[PDB]
């Protein structure tokens, strides 16, 4: 709370609400402009609540302080995804999973971007790389299945 790791805004994000969390992170980034994952929390809140370009701005701040964090690129690509520039998202997903080659969720987002774009096989490699990283993400396995069925390669789907 006060004079500590005030992850309470994280708790409200778990609740999914914004108001107290939003002002809490405002107050954080004028008391601890040290972490940026909090600013990522902000961008995320703006994302679900459709506060798009505010997400973009806070992501760009995340890009100031450590342009080495793949996840700012991930969020930028998500923004691009619901605002059309999918190719830029894809190259960002390159960039991200070059920064953190063993990151899963980037694979998922870029696979969604790909299937939006229309290149199936790249998405196949996305999902497969996810799996060889994790043989337990059964949900992504089912997503594999949906894509493969969309490609009519029934039996292995």
């Amino acid at each position: 709370s006060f004079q500590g790791l005030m992850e309470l805004a994280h708790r409200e994000y778990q609740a999914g609400d914004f108001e107290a969390a939003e002002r809490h992170c405002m107050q954080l980034w004028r008391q601890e402009p040290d972490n940026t994952g909090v600013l990522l929390l902000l961008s995320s809140i703006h994302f679900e609540c459709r506060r798009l370009d505010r997400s973009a701005h806070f992501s760009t701040l995340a890009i100031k302080q450590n342009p080495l964090l793949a996840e700012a690129y991930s969020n930028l690509g998500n923004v691009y995804k619901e605002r059309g520039q999918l190719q830029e998202a894809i190259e960002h997903y390159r960039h991200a999973l070059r920064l953190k080659p063993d990151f899963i969720d980037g694979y998922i987002n870029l696979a969604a971007a790909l299937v939006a774009a229309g290149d199936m096989e790249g998405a196949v490699q996305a999902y497969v790389s996810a799996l060889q990283y994790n043989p337990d993400l059964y949900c992504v396995r089912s997503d594999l299945g949906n894509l493969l069925k969309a490609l009519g390669r029934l039996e292995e789907a």
Partner: peptide, 9 residues
């Protein structure tokens, strides 16, 4: 008769 799981971001 089709279904998906994680379509959001």
């Amino acid at each position: 008769t089709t279904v998906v799981t994680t379509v959001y971001q």
